[PDB]
Amino acid sequence: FDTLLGFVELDHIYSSALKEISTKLSILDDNFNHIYKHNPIHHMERRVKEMRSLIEKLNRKGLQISAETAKEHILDIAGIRVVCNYLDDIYLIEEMLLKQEDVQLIKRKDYIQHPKENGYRSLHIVVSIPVFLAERVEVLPVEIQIRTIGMDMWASLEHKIRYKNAETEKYRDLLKECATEITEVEDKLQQIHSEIT
Amino acid sequence: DTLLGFVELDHIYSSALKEISTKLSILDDNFNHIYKHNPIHHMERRVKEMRSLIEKLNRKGLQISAETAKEHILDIAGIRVVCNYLDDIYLIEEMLLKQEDVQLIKRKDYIQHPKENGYRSLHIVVSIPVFLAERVEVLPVEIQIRTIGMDMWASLEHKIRYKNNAETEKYRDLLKECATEITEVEDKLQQIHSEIT
Amino acid sequence: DTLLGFVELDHIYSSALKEISTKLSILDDNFNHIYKHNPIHHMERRVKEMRSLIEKLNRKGLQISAETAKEHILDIAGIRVVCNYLDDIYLIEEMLLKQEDVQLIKRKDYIQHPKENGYRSLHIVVSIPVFLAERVEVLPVEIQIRTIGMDMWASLEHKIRYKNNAETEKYRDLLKECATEITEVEDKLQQIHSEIT
Amino acid sequence: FDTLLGFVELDHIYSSALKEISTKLSILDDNFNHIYKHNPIHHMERRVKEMRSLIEKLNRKGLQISAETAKEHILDIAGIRVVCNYLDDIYLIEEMLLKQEDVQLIKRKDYIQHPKENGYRSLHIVVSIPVFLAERVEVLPVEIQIRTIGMDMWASLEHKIRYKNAETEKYRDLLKECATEITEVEDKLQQIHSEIT
């Protein structure tokens, strides 16, 4: 059906958006290491929301179900997580990214500055990037989650408890202890690395 | 010190290659999504090694430094885009050059007018911005767009000149015949492919 | 349940493809280190999708399950090894089949004896052990070894049959001519390459 | 010089060795995730010792300097670090690897069972693997260091203090605190993950 075709196109163009941001981030990481001897980025992961998740979300909001609706109302269709070696790399990567001429900052939420009640810590920014296609240019939003390795280890276990669902409450306070415990050890590693660089 | 400049040159022109690769990969994928055909067969990136920069500077009587190479050699970074069919070459060019941040610097169409020795390729030098940690660099990249068959020829011819160049005269008439025979069969394959699409 | 078997089939035959890819990549690299020439131009792996397994099972009147497919279809996993020159094909075969953990199952040389329609490739089915988390599987893999030119032909011919197959008769005489013309030029390029090496 | 050639060959064949082990590990990781919903491996890194480090080491031992000497006396010429998500993945990966028919265990040292005085924790195993080359098979040793993410974060900062050299003593006891602090939080994450899987 015609409606179906748009969502296939949607997956493809947002994947291209991820390619654009990944290359910028890789170049930033690589040049920081060249000038300096430190790679701010440990690894990255990319994902594009599955069409079924998009329709569900659109259904939830009571909106007309098409790809054009999806673009307008869901801005983390494309997501990239940037896992950093040290806490200062997180803020630093953001500065290096957002000062680029063709990167527009759309939304920002700093769960490192303001941790979640559960203990989740990450830096969330939505940015827009031009994507040049065969016969047009698309300016597309991309959700970038920037975090430390420890933050990433915490968030993945928490996530694995939630979706797979009564266990979350059972582990809620102990996961908060780990989020606190992970924060503390990462600032000690941060301040040792700050001193020697 | 002089040597460091060339390491810097390699690094930043390699970053330029990543930027242009991503654009091309996105074009190829979008072209395929629209017309059910992948124009690009493969790509190969290369930065000219410092010894290839110096002899070219020497041949021009230029002072031997990375900044002189930067100013005077526009194929320091080169990417070969190998296409499945001859008409794909000109579609990749059109799709690339209409991007606002891609500027055409030089163009020479050895497909429209082959070299006497039989060589064919479309050469365009374009400029691309590279966003680094603490500065932006606009760098030229030489793009050689050719068919698979043109690439097989050029690789062998390139493998006649560099190793034991004296024989370049010995095979010149036979390599011209092969270039003609490759052209002939690629036009037949092009028109069979055009008819069914 | 039946569906799960096929997901398992895809996964383990994909692992077989990784094992054989690594062997071939190591052979290519070592051949290059000794003789200053890379025999392999590129490779493409593919697992036949479940719909391609079922119709083949149906065509044979076989019960529709992953275990029946496993027993009766030896090209579930296929890798195409595209070589730079015709003589490289037989050297890759010899180098691969002498490995103690590679067993030849089937061989058919369409280069020595092309198909009437013009197709050429060397087909060998080999078995490879795949070491999994909790068991070892010895799985067959169909390897199609061909030159770049053979690959261009087969891709177009393959693109005549599957989409709008009626025209397969229309282009049959013209595709035969192209296969002949590709053979002729690849033997000239082979002998120029052999002489300088 | 003739001696030089052997060391070039050495780098190449030990790199092939790394390719063989990487593929096995990737298949193990991927199959564990298929059967179970957990990827034991977070990431891997490969390195082959630089020729200058090999000569220095041979010089240190007062041995004749050739590639053949190097193979005999240096068994971590090829090294792969396997960074695991949880502490139990480390032991588990080892079991899955060493039960494979063509993997021979050569040496083992468990710094997780027995931490270093500084606080370093990792599992070190040297294994041998057949590498099939163009015209021979080589059974080559490979050093595999298996560790947790936290262990890897600890070890990299410690390493960055040592090579870059009076700072090591300054940070010695504080790095020991982090090694202890990292251990504690990783066993809490381990026991939460053990309970829900």
Residue numbers in the entry:
A (entry chain B), D (entry chain B): 32 to 195, 197 to 229
B (entry chain A), C (entry chain A): 33 to 229
From the paper:
To better understand RelP at the molecular level, we determined the crystal structures of RelP homologues from S. aureus (Sa) and B. subtilis (Bs) at 2.25 and 3.3 Å resolution, respectively. Both, SaRelP and BsRelP form highly symmetrical and oval-shaped homotetramers with a prominent cleft in their centers highly reminiscent of BsRelQ. Helix α1 at the N-terminus of each monomer stabilizes the medial sides of the homotetramer interface via hydrogen bonds and salt bridges (buried surface area of ~1200 Å2). Helices α5 and α6 at the C-terminus of each monomer establish the lateral sides of the homotetramer interface mainly due to polar contacts (buried surface area of ~1200 Å2). The (p)ppGpp synthetase monomers of SaRelP and BsRelP are highly identical and consist of a mixed β-sheet build by five β-strands (β1–β5) that is surrounded by alpha helices (α1–α6). Structural comparison of RelP and RelQ reveals the architecture of the homotetramer as well as each of the monomers is highly similar (r.m.s.d. of 1.292 over 138 Cα atoms for the RelP and RelQ monomers). However, RelP and RelQ differ in the orientation of helix α2, which appears to be shifted approximately 3 Å towards the active site center in RelQ when compared to RelP. Another interesting observation is that the loop connecting β3 and β4, which is disordered in the structure of BsRelQ, could be resolved in both structures of RelP. In stark contrast, the G-Loop of SaRelP was well-ordered and could be unambiguously modeled in its apo- and ATP-bound structures.
